Amino acid sequence: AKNNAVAGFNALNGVELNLFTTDELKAIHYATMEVLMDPGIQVSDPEARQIFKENGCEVNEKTNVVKIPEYLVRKALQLAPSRFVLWGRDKKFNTVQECGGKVHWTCFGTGVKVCKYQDGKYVTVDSVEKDIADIAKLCDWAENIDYFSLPVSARDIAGQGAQDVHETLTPLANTAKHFHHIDPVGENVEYYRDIVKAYYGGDEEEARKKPIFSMLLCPTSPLELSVNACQVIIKGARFGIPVNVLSMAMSGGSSPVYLAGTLVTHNAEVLSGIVLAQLTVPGAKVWYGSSTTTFDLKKGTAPVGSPELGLISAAVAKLAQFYGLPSYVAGSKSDAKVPDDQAGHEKTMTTLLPALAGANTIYGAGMLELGMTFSMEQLVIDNDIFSMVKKAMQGIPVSEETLAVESIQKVGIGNNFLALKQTRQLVDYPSNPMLLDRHMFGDWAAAGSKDLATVAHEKVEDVLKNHQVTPIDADIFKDMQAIVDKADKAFRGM
Amino acid sequence: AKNNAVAGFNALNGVELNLFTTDELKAIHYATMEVLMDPGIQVSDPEARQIFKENGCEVNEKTNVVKIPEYLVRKALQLAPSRFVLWGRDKKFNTVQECGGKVHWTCFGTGVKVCKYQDGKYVTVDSVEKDIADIAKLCDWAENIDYFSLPVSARDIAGQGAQDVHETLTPLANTAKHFHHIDPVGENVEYYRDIVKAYYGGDEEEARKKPIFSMLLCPTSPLELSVNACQVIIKGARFGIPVNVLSMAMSGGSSPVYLAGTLVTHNAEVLSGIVLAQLTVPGAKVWYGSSTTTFDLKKGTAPVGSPELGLISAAVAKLAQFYGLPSYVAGSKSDAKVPDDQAGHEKTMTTLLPALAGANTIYGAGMLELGMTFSMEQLVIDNDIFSMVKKAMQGIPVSEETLAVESIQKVGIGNNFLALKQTRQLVDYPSNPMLLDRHMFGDWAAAGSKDLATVAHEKVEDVLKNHQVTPIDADIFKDMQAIVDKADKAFRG
Amino acid sequence: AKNNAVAGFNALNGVELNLFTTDELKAIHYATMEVLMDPGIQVSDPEARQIFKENGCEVNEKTNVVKIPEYLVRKALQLAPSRFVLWGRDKKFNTVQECGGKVHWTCFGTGVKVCKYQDGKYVTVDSVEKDIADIAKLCDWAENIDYFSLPVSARDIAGQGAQDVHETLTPLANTAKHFHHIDPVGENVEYYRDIVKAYYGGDEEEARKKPIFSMLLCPTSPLELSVNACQVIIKGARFGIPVNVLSMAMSGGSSPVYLAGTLVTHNAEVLSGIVLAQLTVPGAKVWYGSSTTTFDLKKGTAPVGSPELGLISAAVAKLAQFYGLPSYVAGSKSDAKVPDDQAGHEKTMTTLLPALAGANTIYGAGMLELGMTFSMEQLVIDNDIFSMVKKAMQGIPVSEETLAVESIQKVGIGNNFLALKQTRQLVDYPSNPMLLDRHMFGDWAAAGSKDLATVAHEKVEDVLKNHQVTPIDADIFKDMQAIVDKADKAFRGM
Amino acid sequence: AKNNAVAGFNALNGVELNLFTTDELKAIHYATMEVLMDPGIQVSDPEARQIFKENGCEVNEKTNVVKIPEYLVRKALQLAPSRFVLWGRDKKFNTVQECGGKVHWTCFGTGVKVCKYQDGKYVTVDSVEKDIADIAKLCDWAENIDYFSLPVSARDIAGQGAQDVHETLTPLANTAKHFHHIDPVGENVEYYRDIVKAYYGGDEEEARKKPIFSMLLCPTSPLELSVNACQVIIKGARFGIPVNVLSMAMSGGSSPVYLAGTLVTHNAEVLSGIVLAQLTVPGAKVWYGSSTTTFDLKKGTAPVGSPELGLISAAVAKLAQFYGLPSYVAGSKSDAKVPDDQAGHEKTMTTLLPALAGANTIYGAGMLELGMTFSMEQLVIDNDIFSMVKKAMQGIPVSEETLAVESIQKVGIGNNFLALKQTRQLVDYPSNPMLLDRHMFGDWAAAGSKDLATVAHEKVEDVLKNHQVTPIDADIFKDMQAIVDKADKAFRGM
Ligand code: NA
Ligand code: NA
Ligand code: NA
Ligand code: NA
């Protein structure tokens, strides 16, 4: 009968996107190891500078300049786990972060304005702790949004209390998907530790095992570690909070105009963060990350929706895969000041590259205005664009079955597979976009001839008006909120 | 001193995107052959059937089903030139089509409706012959549209005259660039040949030694070769005109719901058309094309701005590089009825994949509404998109200079490169979009707060109102004009 | 949430076995190419010598020695179909023979003796057409036997008529699988053509489009094309019958002691056949075959159960894949004069190697005594072996599901997977040997303490007295049976 | 003239068997570093448990559940040697165990029954310390048996004396080949260390330098480390006694039905044991071993003669080579009760797969009845198979001399090589089995139509009587024999 015995067969599952060779990967490494020694990094916080020294570095106390020897970069890289798991309040939302090409998406972070609908026209308005609750609710419904990252700032809590300890409980409550705090504060890290230890009722061990709060720090480009960042890392490590050491460098700005040199300036900064982490607590969960892009040597902005942002995040991932770490990179971002043709493009352009390259986590969903405004319409739109990607990422499955030769034959010359059994079993196999319109001119017209913004906007309302977000336990919540009030109290007592 | 010597070094220039492995490529191939022997392929054209029979196929004269032996696919593929040049009336538009990754873009083709303006809004009219004379004018200006493919059908010529011969002189007339005729007629291929022999002054050599015109054809899925097709090929071969054998299958409709299967069906049809071409005139200029997409088993239509399409065009571009022929795949399309947020995503998703796979020619620029409308506005957007795509395909160039180690050092800790000499030199290195906005909310708002559609629209006007298209010779034009006239004459006959 | 998106992942399905680098392959080819020009092969038949001569072959008529130019070796290898399919009378037995590693099995062909059981022990007596009938029925049951190949000879028809023609109708009659004739006779090739054509109701189109018969010739080692072999090709190619150009060299005998060298001699012999096949009729179905083995300079016999046999088939298989042709090779062959311990080892040693190598068709199933005797018992035992192989060929399927991390987890430390949901969905996943006894000592002895030999013998009997075979149509059989007679009478007429 | 200058050339020496890609290794790895953290590994022994905690391991003191951080796996591995040597009392038996594909064989261990010749038939009688004596004498002779591994138990010592110590000196005196103790005891490791120090005469460095004693232990599936096992690792590690950290999972019982998943469990277990040994003593010679098999939920037992076992070992050998350590896998085992066809087959299946993948040590020779009985006949047989296995691993040597185009010509069309020089010189080159019969039928019948089993029985007999085992210096044996006494004496003091 038909064969069912085959010899070794080499296959390709999904889509492979190559940006470097080892000889090239290594060069980028060497150049960074050089830069790490001259000039080195400016580590402002003294405690961190202390840890660096103890472990073998060369710290210049008058200029706060540390020189990291490759052997530490090496050692650091051996301590770090190649994988850890982000937890949610609903285990179903858990998300894994592991050295590989297993792609996950998260929303933008962190904007200051919100693109809400006013009198017929969408209006850019200043964000507030409440806007955060709405986004959080929305992203709790968006499937492709694995976990939540602080979308906008609680500006209205500015000089009022612990805005940062605020941007913690709000998210944890308006969603059950893991929370990634983009704006942490080195001195208030204990507050996050507490708020979580609170969720798991006074039990710390549990909050270390099932962490629901992770944070992001930023090496100040070029070649500097802010005191805020040093404490975020150190506290992040010791307590058990995953730490994303993401970078924001700009070709022609804080790093070379060339993409390659830029990567170096980035690698150096991010690697010094990761090093500082493992020297504090070996096995500290870390993220080799980046949001680096290029400086528009003209317009006067940080274009975050251009191929460069895409290529770099793409590359950053490949570098993370090379170092054995999980990647969190900029992706699905746009410089469009509105959800129009451009927006859709730049979003698709900056996400597909990093995804095919295997970015363990791409952030930018729902963002607009080069990271200034956050649009909920743009989000659900992006959240759909990802589904398309996840299909494309399916690439081409070549098997005797998928080849379907008999199938081709049964149908014969000049017929259709419509009736056929197989065709019916694969009704869902094809990509079925939630918001994209695949209708005739009639169907569409006889439905309002609405553009995607509108189609999406109508979706924004619906979700908000009915999505069901698993709420935090009655008492537990008041325990957590306790730490927030204590944080505001502490704060006002200048 | 500084080093200036290096041993063996393996580099990666560009962005390498992979879909298959050899073992898998072979697999696809066998299915394609295993199918080429059963059921086979229906060849309605009796002259074709003879050509096939003449070489060793099993031409069942009563059903027309030809059966092609792998060895004939082997000789076919060893005859078809791996590369051939396209010529625009303007030498500076020449476009090399060669088995490999050298990618090029060409506008969409060929719809029946145009998305133009009216009263503050865009409206869907029905294509005409004055439209083609404009689409051609724009594409002549569009710097990422290497050559011209028929945009929309000159409807005001149906039953009036030879719509095709009209659809030939009009384009060639309104664009120095090359012309790829989407809907040519097998019985009039000689008309075209002559319209060209004219431009060159009755010199059928300069007409061969400089194809300023090429054509397309689509085997009828699944596994059929329409009569018009076989003649477009046979004549195209005989006259020495570049023929593009593009498939039109639809997973879940005319081909297996699966892609691998769909590729087999596509491979089957496209190849046969290639074998038929070669057996006609060894060395005939052919293409391994495809517009194959998936039938939306949930909307009762053919989504062509979907990731499904993207993957198919990209896969075809590989099967193309595999056998050894130039590719022409369906990319940069969208099922969006309006140049909105969707247009971007869809256009980008579908153009990217083939662009990165190495499609030798990607077409669909300007399209909209699954392929019924041609927005002059989207065309320009897509053209600015292609530009961005290009910077992308440059990936990361890792060299001792691009790594800029010394640069990082002269600037050092906490400073900028704005000053740096090297940086002042690379001012035109970073991607610079023509339409895409990258300003602040302020700057942009004080512009009118124009969305890309509106902005892309004002660009069209500017182009149509001021683009100087290199005009055909005065007489030369009147000569060709006649070929169209005589053609229309015979028509009314 | 749970990951459902991954990029470029290279995987290995099944088990891969390598024998050569492309350089060694090419090298072997180069020897072969030169050996064809010097000394060249001896084409005993004039018709073929002519055919060769016409396409540009230096043909010395005084010695019949033909020299083949590389470009012809090339032309032919490009003319031979990469794939063709064997047809059984039951479309549910059809077997695909196509370049690659799609492994298939067939019984041995063809011994002169039959090893049966008489007075308690095993008795090796001479075969008779009846035996052929019994083997045919037996194999029509065995799953792993894709198709049937003339197992033994009708030594009783010897002298009474044309045995080879009887050797055609009997097999085609006792089994509805495909029939591969190991002993065709060049002059009678037409008799086969008709029995088949007869079967199809005279329609030759159907006989050519659905070959129910195929045959194998043999280059005469070292470097000779016997007329018998020449006619089989020329006539096979013309009629439309799959021809198997299989070599039978012997290291230390008709080829060097080394194996690399024996492969050259073989390669030279086999290709010369294909050159003929294609030059006769372009596109003729062909098989790159071998059963070459090493000679045991010590024992004076050419062992066909030695590792060298296995090594050689494996190599030939690869050589076929190199030239783009389907392969037919030895394997699953033993030298032991009875189904004992030796038997099982040699069977495996020679079937395992060629199999993991991708041989398109392994033949030798149910054979004993250096290819002299056919063992009804060893055929079922072997058949089951082919199963344990098909399983082994699955190797390790590594996917998110196979890794089944959750599975290991839900079960947890110090527990059993016994009553776990997934375990019960894979109840039939493991290898389930039909003969090989996998019972405790107890359960076995309480079943007669039967060794594999006897246990087999019993399932042999059951299969014969109980297996049904799709009979050929009454009307048709007499038509074919008539072709047999028109040949027997004509044989006697001398 | 004749060339003797050739540019770069890629060659494949032997046969290569693949199973995973790197992406797939990384995959299997992560799942092990995922499991190694959750659930974790239960360490029964507190002394070892302390060692884990000491080195940053999170111990759940109450449940005894140790969570091993990936970095401890990485560090453990960096410490472990990539090679070490096994010594025999006879310098000529020294066996190297090194990361790579250098294959070696050792007898099965450790059954409790000896298949011996009763009244004309084979009987399964319970073993005794004496059995070990002879089995040791047998193996000593078997050239394809690198070193000896306690095959049967000194059953007649249970509840009478220090059995395991009897299972030490006994093997050691009845063979000069290295002895691997399959079942050592955590509280007697010191007796062994002393006994060895005795052979060398006080010099412990000699005992460290030339270990003539190694020992194995088995983690408890799934995810457990019995008290005894832990002590084995620790003591062996501290004394400089190699230690085989061999796992014994069962697909469908203690590990996922799938093999990928099972391997993951195998990995977690076998690694933890490696991590322990290392943390206890950096540089402790160890083994990444396994005998994990499948479990026919049907037959009611775990068959160690199935293709599953075959694949598993192979898979484990690769993993072993992946991590840089030596392998000790199960192979050359059978489920058959009597040495019949099944034996010879199942043995070649389980032994060939690992030999090819390149197991650094394969063990299962001389075994039958799913690991219950130890056949002395099957032993001499398996050993002779390994010879055929060894030839097979020679694959095809492609070279100017091996291709031998001159030789092919020197002989020419239709003439043999038997008379040729190159042939008479290579008379020893082909595989020459000791028991596999390659005689024609006639010669065989004369020999008395003896199967392989009995011809094997006659060989065992011939060996047990006449093979001489090197005498341990009489005096030294006294010293050694003495320490075994102190082992018994002490034993009765409880
Ligand atoms: Na694939
Ligand atoms: Na590059
Ligand atoms: Na696999
Ligand atoms: Na070799």
Residue numbers in the entry:
A (entry chain D), C (entry chain A), D (entry chain F): 2 to 495
B (entry chain C): 2 to 494
Q: Can you quote the paper on this entry?
A:
The 22nd genetically encoded amino acid, pyrrolysine, plays a unique role in the key step in the growth of methanogens on mono-, di-, and tri-methylamines by activating the methyl group of these substrates for transfer to a corrinoid cofactor. A substrate:corrinoid methyltransferase catalyzes the demethylation of the specific methylamine, and subsequently transfers this methyl group onto an associated corrinoid protein. In summary, we have determined the structures of native MttB, and its complexes with a substrate analog, sulfite, and its physiological relevant corrinoid protein, MttC. These structures have provided new insights into the mechanism of activation of pyrrolysine that is distinct from the previously determined MtmB structure, and details of the key steps in the pyrrolysine-mediated transfer of methyl groups from methylamine substrates to the cobalamin cobalt in corrinoid proteins.
In our first structure of a pyrrolysine-containing protein, the monomethylamine methyltransferase MtmB, we demonstrated that addition of dithionite to MtmB crystals resulted in addition of a sulfite group to the pyrrolysine imine carbon. We sought to use a similar approach to clarify the details of the conformational states of pyrrolysine in MttB and to provide a structure of this protein bound to a substrate analog. While the structures of MttB and the MttB-sulfite complex are nearly the same (RMSD = 0.458 and 0.492 Å for the A subunits and overall hexamer, respectively), one significant change was the loss of the water that hydrogen bonds the pyrroline nitrogen in the native MttB structure. It should be noted that the water that hydrogen bonds the pyrroline imine nitrogen in the native MttB structure is absent in both the sulfite-bond MttB and the MttB-MttC complex. This may suggest that during turnover, addition of TMA to pyrrolysine may precede MttC binding—since nucleophilic addition to pyrrolysine would be slower without a hydrogen bond donor.
